[PDB]
Amino acid sequence: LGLREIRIHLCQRSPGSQGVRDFIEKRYVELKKANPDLPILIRECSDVQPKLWARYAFGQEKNVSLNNFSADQVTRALENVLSSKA
Template sequence: MSGRYAFAKGLKELRFLFCQTGEHSSATRSFLTRAYPIMKKNNPTIPIMLREAQGTLPRVYARYGPSTSCFRDEPWDLLANN
């Protein structure tokens, strides 16, 4: 498997929140359009949820277990550090 967008073994879920039309979410939409197919191909068993809501600021949440999670304002930071 390619190392590109290969998630940590302990990751249970990845959730992206963003606005479907807002300018403040344009980078997130662009990132997901490009990266989602690769992330899903390299991590087929991990749920990757995309949640669109009007006026929502872009955020990403990563769940590692029953009580462990990580929150980032910019999704590419979380993925770049793995």
């Protein structure tokens, strides 16, 4: 029916999370201003691979690996998540 929350898991230090870090340092603020009532949970952890969880209506969760992406690839995957709403 629609998207309910977004979860972005990433590392603080790993290079595979680097573009994901480059997404949050630059493009997260206007993302949150564009989606004010959508919870976009950024969860940093020690050695995790980057990951984009999209929980939809009735508990359905899609799962996108963000490993070794640039900030533009994270932006395109996240806007595919925002525009899908499946």
